[PDB]
């Protein structure tokens, strides 16, 4: 009769950077979604594949929660089929994604006067990330023909930057916290279902 640790993810103290998003596997508990789609606190609750009304009355095999923080002008890229820097180098969603993406502003908990450089993100890479691929390498990206072999300079950059979060930025540059709940349907007796 245990309850799913939904509060441990949404009310968490700190979120990981977008480049290395956190991952939480939820199972063996009863899921009560009435709190989610009736909270009036999330600024985005898009669902692809199902609807918030029917989502509660449908059994799920497994569920994964990927939480991160991205700037305001990059929340429109977390969707199946979209492209961009975040959609090819940081977080790539599959084309047959069946799940939901919650998002809410956090301009009062992830900001500080002078700049907050604790949230990193990848900018340069060789190829595009596969669906649900994680990369935490910090090697020097090579853009030219000459091999830099680990020294920075011309044609050799650092593939990790960070946003300058400040409390005086526009809504496009404000740090929004995003949580993607994916439902990987497999062959299982549906251990987790709603009332």
């Amino acid at each position, epitope marked *: 009769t245990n309850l799913c640790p939904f509060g441990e993810v949404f009310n968490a103290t700190r979120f990981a950077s977008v480049y290395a998003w956190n991952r939480k596997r939820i199972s063996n508990c009863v899921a009560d979604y009435s709190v989610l789609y009736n909270s009036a606190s999330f600024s985005t609750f898009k669902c692809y594949g199902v609807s918030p009304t029917k989502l509660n009355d449908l059994c799920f095999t497994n569920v994964y929660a990927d939480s991160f923080v991205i700037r305001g002008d990059e929340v429109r890229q977390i969707a199946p089929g979209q492209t961009g820097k975040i959609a090819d180098y940081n977080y790539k969603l599959p084309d047959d994604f069946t799940g939901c993406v919650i998002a809410w502003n956090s301009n009062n908990l992830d900001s500080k006067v*002078g*700049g907050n*450089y604790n949230y990193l993100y990848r*900018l*340069f890479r060789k190829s595009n990330l596969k669906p649900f691929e994680r990369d935490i390498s*910090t090697e020097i990206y090579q853009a030219g023909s000459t091999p830099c072999n680990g*020294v*920075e*300079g*011309f*044609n050799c*950059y*650092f593939p*990790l*930057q*960070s*946003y*300058g979060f400040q409390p005086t930025n526009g809504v496009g540059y404000q740090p929004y916290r995003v949580v993607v709940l994916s439902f990987e349907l497999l062959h299982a007796p549906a251990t987790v279902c709603g009332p």
Partner: antibody
Amino acid sequence: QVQLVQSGAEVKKPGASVKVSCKASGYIFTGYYMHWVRQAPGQGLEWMGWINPNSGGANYAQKFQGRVTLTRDTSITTVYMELSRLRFDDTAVYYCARGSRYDWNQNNWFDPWGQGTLVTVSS
Amino acid sequence: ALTQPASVSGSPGQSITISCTGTSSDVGTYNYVSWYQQHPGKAPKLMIFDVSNRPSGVSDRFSGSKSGNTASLTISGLQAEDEADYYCSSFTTSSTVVFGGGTKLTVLG
């Protein structure tokens, strides 16, 4: 607006170690290389080296290859330059400047410059 | 380093050409030569970046040219607010900045 501030003037003795701090305010501190330029009293400009405040790497000149250390601190957005084993030819003004961009394409000029700190080594 | 003339003197309204001679690895490969001006007892100000482009707040009296492995700074219409120290800098192929010997402009008159 963007700006860089330095510490006050310093006076040392032959054999001591000086440490100059440079604080940047007004832009993304971890998106622009930081160069250091030394100028002797009544002499031309001299390039000491640059440091990347994003990752932590640094490249110094051949003259200062052994007795200089450039460090960063992103919590307070400062860059420290430590010069050890001072001599009589090390008395100069040390400007900290914002160098190239993170990809060496857009910015390639030292702007803006610091206010200028003096280091007077004497016995 | 980069070799510059010692001192150049000219009359107001005329034109002076300062020649910064570099190296095939400094001015022959890249085109990132810059010209800075420093007044006595102040921080060096950025005058010209990009051998052609000039930043905002700079007058048209200064211009820059490049032909081969030698850059040039052309100052036209000399006034009293022009006497200062001019330095030419450039980025080598090994990601290293190199400055010049420094030129002093003595406005005659």
